[PDB]
Amino acid sequence: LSRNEIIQSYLSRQSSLLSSSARQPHVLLPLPTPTDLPGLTREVTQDDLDRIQAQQWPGVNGCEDTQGNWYDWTQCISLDPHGDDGRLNILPYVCLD
Amino acid sequence: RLSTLIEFLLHRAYSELMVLTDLLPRKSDVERKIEIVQFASRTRQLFVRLLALVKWANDAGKVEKCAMISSFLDQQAILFVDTADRLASLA
Amino acid sequence: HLEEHLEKFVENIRQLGIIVSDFQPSSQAGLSQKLNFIVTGLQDIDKCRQQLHDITVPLEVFEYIDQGRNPQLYTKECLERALAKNEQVKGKIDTMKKFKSLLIQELSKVFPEDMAKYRSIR
Amino acid sequence: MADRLTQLQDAVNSLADQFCNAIGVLQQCGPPASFANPTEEYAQLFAALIARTAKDIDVLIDSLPSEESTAALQAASLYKLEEE
Amino acid sequence: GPFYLMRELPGSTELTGSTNLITHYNLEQAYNKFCDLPGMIDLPGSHDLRSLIEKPPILGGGTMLSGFRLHTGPL
C-alpha cells in the first residue's frame, strides 16, 4: 500500500480476481427453512433434496432462478450470475475447489 | 562559539602590528600603513559578523521552539503514516 | 534588548576604528588592536551573560544555524508536506466516496440490509 | 470457490490499495493539469474487476453452504448411499 | 446510534501538523524585510584587495602590486 505502480496494480487485480472469483440477475437465495442444524433438526431425506433441487431453496442443490438459470448441486449451466456481460459456462453451484 | 572569531581577529591585528613595528625603521611605512588598514578592515568585518550573529541568536530561543514544534508534528505524522502502512501491509 | 545594544555598540566601535585607520596614521597603530581586544572582551561578557541567564541557545545549535544557511529550506519542506497531506486527504475522500458508491451499488444489487447497516453506523 | 480459509483480508487490502492507487493517479499525478491510454485502461480494468469480484463474492456468500452436513449426519448419509 | 461493539471515537483536535504552521512560525516579517526571490536576492547583497576579502565574508559566511594601486588623498 506504500509503493504502487502499473505492475503492482496488475498483480493486485489478478490476485483479487483469483481470490474472490446484459441481464446479470443475481439470484438472492434466502436462508432455507429445511436444513439440518438450525433448520428442521432432521436428516437429509428425499424431501429436502427435491425442495433444494426443484424449488428455489439453497439447501443442498441451490435455489434456481428465472431465465432457465438451473443451479443444481453439480449443474455447470451457462448463466450470467457474474457482474459482467460474459454468460460463459460457469462452474457448479458447489464449486468445490 | 562566536568569541573565538573575535579573539583570532584581535590576535591577527596584534601580530600584524608587531610585525610592522619590528621592521618599521628599515623600509618606508607605505606598506605598513596599508597592512594596518587591511587589519583594521578585517577586524571591522569580524566585529560586524559577530554583531550579526548576536542579532540572529537573539531570537534563537523562539527559533528552536518553533523548530521543535514542527519536528514533533512531522514526527507524529510520519509515525501515524508508518503505522497505517504497516497495518495495511500486514493485513 | 541588552544583546542587540551590545552588538550595535561593537559594530559602531568597529566602524569608528576603521574610519580612524582610514585617515593618516600618525600615532601608534595599537588602537586597532585595542579596539579588537575590547570587542573580544565585550563578546566574552555577552556570552557569559547568555550562559548565566539560562538561555535556550546552545553552542552546537548556534554554530549549525550560523553555517551560512537559513530556515527557507525547512519552510519549503513544511509547505511541500502540507501540500502532500492535502493531496492525500483529497485522495482518501475520493476513495471513501467511491467505496460508499460501491457499497450502495452492492446493496441495491445483492443485499441492502447488511450493507446499509455496515455503511450507516458500522 | 464457495469456501472460506484465507481470502477475505487479502482481497480487502488489495481492493483498498487499488482504490488508493486509482484515486492517486486520478487526482495527484496525471494529465489532469500541471501546477495516458495504458493507465486509463488499467484503472478501468481494475474498477470493473473489483466490482465484479465484490458482486460474485456477495452472491457466493449468500449461496454458500449453511450449517448442514454435520459429522454424524454426513456419516449416516454416506453409509446409506454406499449401501444403495 | 452507537450499538453494541462500537469502536471508540478519536479526539477532537490533538497535536496536528495539518494546520497552517507557516503563520505560527512568524515568517511574515522576514519575508517583508527581505524585499523564493526574497531569500535568493539576499545571498550576496547586504542592504540597499580589500573588496575580495570583504566579498568572502558574504560568500562563505602580491603586496606591492596591490599597494601601488592605493594612491588616494583625503577625498
Side-chain angles (χ1 to χ4, degrees), chain A residues 22 25 30 32 34 38-39 54 58-59 62 68 81 83 86 92, chain B residues 13 25 40 52 57 60-61 67 77 84 88 91, chain C residues 17 25 29-30 41 58 68 71 82 84 91 112 116, chain D residues 2 11 16 22 24 30-33 36 38 43 47-48 51 54 65 71-72 75-76, chain E residues 1-35 38-39 44-45 56-57 60-62 66-67 73-74:
Chain E
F3 293 152
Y4 70 99
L5 192 64
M6 287 307 175
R7 289 173 167 164
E8 53 92 21
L9 279 295
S12 158
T13 297
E14 48 265 42
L15 291 173
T16 307
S18 306
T19 43
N20 264 317
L21 75 162
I22 307 95
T23 42
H24 194 69
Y25 182 69
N26 307 329
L27 205 51
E28 189 53 276
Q29 77 296 328
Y31 187 82
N32 310 130
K33 68 102 173 180
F34 287 164
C35 289
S66 87

